[PDB]
From a paper:
To elucidate the structural basis underlying antigen recognition and the high binding affinity of 5G6 for GPIbα, we solved the crystal structure of 5G6 Fab in complex with its epitope peptide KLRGVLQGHL (hGPIbα residues 461–470, short for KL10) at 2.4-Å resolution. The N-terminally acetylated epitope peptide contains 10 residues, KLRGVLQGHL, corresponding to residues 461–470 of human GPIbα (referred to as KL10). The crystal belongs to the space group C2221, with two Fab-peptide complexes in each asymmetric unit. In the complex, 5G6 Fab adopts the canonical structure of IgG1 and belongs to the CH1/CLκ subtype, with 4 of the 6 CDR (complementarity-determining region) loops conforming to canonical classes, as defined by Chothia and colleagues. Notably, 5G6 Fab binds only to one side of the epitope peptide without obstructing both termini and it interacts with the entire peptide at an approximate right angle. Over the groove residues, Gly464-Gln467 of the epitope peptide adopts a helix-like structure. As a result, the shedding cleavage site, the Gly464-Val465 peptide bond1027, is not in direct contact with 5G6. Third, all polar residues in the epitope peptide, Lys461, Arg463, Gln467 and His469, are located on the same side of the peptide that is in direct contact with 5G6 Fab, and they constitute the majority of the binding interface. Fourth, it is also notable that the side chains of all hydrophobic residues in the epitope peptide, Leu462, Val465, Leu466 and Leu470, point away from the binding interface, supporting the idea that several of these residues are part of the hydrophobic core of the juxtamembrane MSD of GPIbα26. In the complex structure, Thr102–105 in CDRH3, along with Asp93 in CDRL3 were the key residues for 5G6 in mediating binding specificity and affinity, while Arg463 was the corresponding key residue for peptide KL10.
The GPIb-IX complex, the second most abundant receptor complex on the platelet surface, mediates a crucial step in platelet adhesion by interacting with its ligand von Willebrand factor (vWF). GPIbα ectodomain shedding is catalyzed by ADAM17 (a disintegrin and metalloproteinase 17), which cleaves GPIbα between Gly464 and Val465 910. Among these antibodies, 5G6 and its monomeric Fab fragment (5G6 Fab) showed the highest binding affinity for purified GPIb-IX complex and inhibited GPIbα shedding with a similar potency as that of GM6001 without affecting the shedding of other receptors, platelet activation or aggregation. Overall, in the present study, we determined the 5G6 Fab-KL10 complex structure, which confirmed the direct association of 5G6 with GPIbα residues flanking the shedding cleavage site, and elucidated the molecular basis underlying the binding specificity and high affinity.
Residue numbers in the entry:
A (entry chain B): 1 to 212
B (entry chain A): 1 to 135, 142 to 221
C (entry chain C): 1 to 10
The structure:
Amino acid sequence: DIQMTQSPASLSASVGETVTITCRASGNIYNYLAWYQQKQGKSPQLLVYNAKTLADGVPSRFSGSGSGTQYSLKINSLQPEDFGSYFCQHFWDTPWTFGGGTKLEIKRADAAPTVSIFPPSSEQLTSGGASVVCFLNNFYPKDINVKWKIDGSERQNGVLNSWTDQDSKDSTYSMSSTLTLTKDEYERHNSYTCEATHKTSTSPIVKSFNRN
Amino acid sequence: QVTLKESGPGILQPSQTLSLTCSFSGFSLSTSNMGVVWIRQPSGKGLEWLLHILWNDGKFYNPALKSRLTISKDTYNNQVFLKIANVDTADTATYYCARLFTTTTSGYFDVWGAGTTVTVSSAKTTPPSVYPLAPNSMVTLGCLVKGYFPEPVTVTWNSGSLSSGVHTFPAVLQSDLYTLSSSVTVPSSPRPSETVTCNVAHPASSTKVDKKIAA
Amino acid sequence: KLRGVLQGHL
């Protein structure tokens, strides 16, 4: 059907920079493209309609452009309030379709994750379960990989990952990785290992414990 | 003073019918070029056009959902009624109604509602289990908050005194139940020398617990 | 182009 392909998914930037977000329709939409802006946790607001017409309340440092299938949104000299997510949407043939969104995020210095591993607690064990948790705290950039190993061998079943949004204070990211086993599966093995791979080092960060 | 406000059940079991009401003011659905649209957005994901109803009672549907969709308007009481039949878990999302301004030469949603959260699951209210997460100049501790329903959960450290070096992770669904962890980084001196406890509330189950972290 | 029925307008 008529699809919007928005890129990039993610964009790191600094106040003062000029950035541009692109949207491609899978077919001609005749300039009927709106842009919406969404703050973390909030309802989206209209920035632009008919591709290049600014909505009320919107400063001239925003502009839209393009025609046919190729449209873009350009922000001159970013300001702090500009950080958030941006979505395009077309108003041509139904079904109307939104772009996947672009996260405009704050640029900062690279930082390696601080990694911590935690054996299942005494109290959890008595209930019938065993979660092993690993924290990968305060890294930048947001791109990161975690590998679990049991007794030296990689494990993938039962791991659940969760990632924080960019931190409002230090512009850093964090994630938790949780390996959930049964109590008795946990007890048939001894070595538990959480490995973080991030561009700040070519060698992964390794946290490990033995059930003893 | 264009305003819109969604109302809904909050939580629903699968196979049921989701009824959502949009109450609006500051514009009329008897005026041309006006409509009300419904849009939804699963937490942390993109936006999806569901359907709209126009001032002249024209109705338009997302074909993927059109079989399950029903919409009407009550123009005198300024309300639009949405029904989604037979919900599955993928229908879990924030739901927005918004004013559609539409002409032969333009289209846009210039005013939106704040949104209303809708959860579709078989799960029942379930308090969380709180487990302590114990192990340079800094040490990291944690709190595992496991098996609760529904969202949200509040996690705090030392009733609030610890604010710096706290991360609380987004919940994650595991067998119809939420699990979440909180992390705290304090100097290795304050602990276990001094007391670090996490404070956990789950208002839907009236749960309020404090768990000290012993070494 | 103008927007019509097929583009969700009336």
